[PDB]
Write a protein that binds this ligand. Structure first.
Ligand SMILES: [Ca+2]
Lengths: 224, 52
C-alpha cells in the first residue's frame, strides 16, 4: 500500500495472508472455511494465515491453516488477466472470533465515488522496495468506468474496475494482490494489477467480486 | 533473453526470482509480480546461471 496508514490492531479481522516460504499475497475470509484471493496468486501449496497484524511477530491471535483446495476461476486468462479470482478452501474451519472473522459478499455492484478500504502488506514505495511488517490501509474511491478505460485503453475487461486516484501517490502494490477492497461493509474488490504503483493516471485495477457471487456460492456447495 | 532488465510486471504478488545482470555478470534476485514481464526470469539462481 503506497500512501496509506497502519491499520488499527484488531480492525480487519477478515484480512488474510497467503504463505509459502513467505508472505506473497493477501486474501479475504468469506466463510469459516473459504478464502477469496486472486488467480494469479495461485500456488500448488499454500498455508493461510489469519488473525495477523504484524506478519513477523507472533502476537497470539493467529491461526495457520493449510489450503486443502485451491481453485482458480475456470475462465481466468493469464494473458489478459480477465477473471482474476480464486477460491481457497481451508483444511480445517477457522475459529471465528474478535480477531478472525468473515467479510460479506457484495449484494450490489460498486458505485463510482464510493469510498473504500484497501489493505495489505504490499510495498509502500512507488520506486524502490519497502515492505512493511504491519498491516496497511488506504481509503480510496471507486472510479467511473470512463476513468478506468481512459487510463488503460484496450485493457479493461468486464471483470475489472478501478479504485484510487488519477493524480497518483496512493495505491495498492506488490504483495497486496488477492487482498480486499471493502466498501460499506462488503467485499467489492480483489487487488489484481496496475501499471507501476501509485503512478499518475495508472490507478489500481481490481476484480469485481459481485460478478462471481453465483460462482462462489456454487463452488462452495460443490466442494462441501 | 539474458539481457532484458528485471521486470516485475503489472501483477501485484511478490515472488522471489532470478535474472541475469549484465553489469555484474552474474544472476541476482528480484521480486516478480506473478504475470507478464519477460524471459529473464528464473526460479533458481543455479538455473539462471545455467542459461545465462
Ligand atoms: Ca503476527
Amino acid at each position: 500500500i503506497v500512501g496509506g496508514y497502519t491499520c488499527e490492531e484488531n480492525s480487519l479481522p477478515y484480512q488474510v495472508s497467503l504463505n509459502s516460504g513467505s508472505h506473497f499475497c493477501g486474501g479475504s475470509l468469506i466463510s469459516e472455511q473459504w478464502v477469496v484471493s486472486a488467480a494469479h496468486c495461485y500456488k500448488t501449496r499454500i498455508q493461510v494465515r489469519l488473525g495477523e497484524h504484524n506478519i513477523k511477530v507472533l502476537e497470539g491471535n493467529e491461526q495457520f491453516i493449510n489450503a486443502a483446495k485451491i481453485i482458480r476461476h475456470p475462465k481466468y486468462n493469464r494473458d489478459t488477466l480477465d477473471n482474476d479470482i480464486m477460491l481457497i478452501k481451508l483444511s480445517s474451519p477457522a475459529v471465528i472470533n474478535a480477531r478472525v472473522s468473515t467479510i460479506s459478499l457484495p449484494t450490489a455492484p460498486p458505485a463510482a465515488g464510493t469510498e473504500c478500504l484497501i489493505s495489505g502488506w504490499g510495498n509502500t514505495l512507488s520506486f524502490g522496495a519497502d515492505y512493511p511488517d504491519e498491516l496497511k490501509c488506504l481509503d480510496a474511491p471507486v472510479l467511473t468506468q470512463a476513468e478506468c478505460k481512459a487510463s488503460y485503453p484496450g485493457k479493461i475487461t468486464n471483470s475489472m474496475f478501478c479504485v484510487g486516484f488519477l493524480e497518483g501517490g496512493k495505491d495498492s502494490c506488490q504483495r497486496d494482490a488477492g487482498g480486499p477492497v471493502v466498501c460499506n461493509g462488503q467485499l467489492q474488490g480483489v487487488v489484481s494489477w496496475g501499471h507501476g504503483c501509485a503512478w499518475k493516471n495508472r490507478p489500481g485495477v481490481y476484480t469485481k467480486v459481485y460478478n462471481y457471487v453465483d460462482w462462489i456460492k456454487d463452488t462452495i456447495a460443490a466442494n462441501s | 533473453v539474458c539481457s532484458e532488465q528485471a521486470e516485475t510486471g503489472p501483477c501485484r504478488a511478490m515472488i522471489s526470482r532470478w535474472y541475469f545482470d549484465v553489469t555484474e555478470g552474474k544472476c541476482a534476485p528480484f521480486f516478480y509480480g506473478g504475470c507478464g514481464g519477460n524471459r529473464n526470469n528464473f526460479d533458481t539462481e543455479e538455473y539462471c546461471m545455467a542459461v545465462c
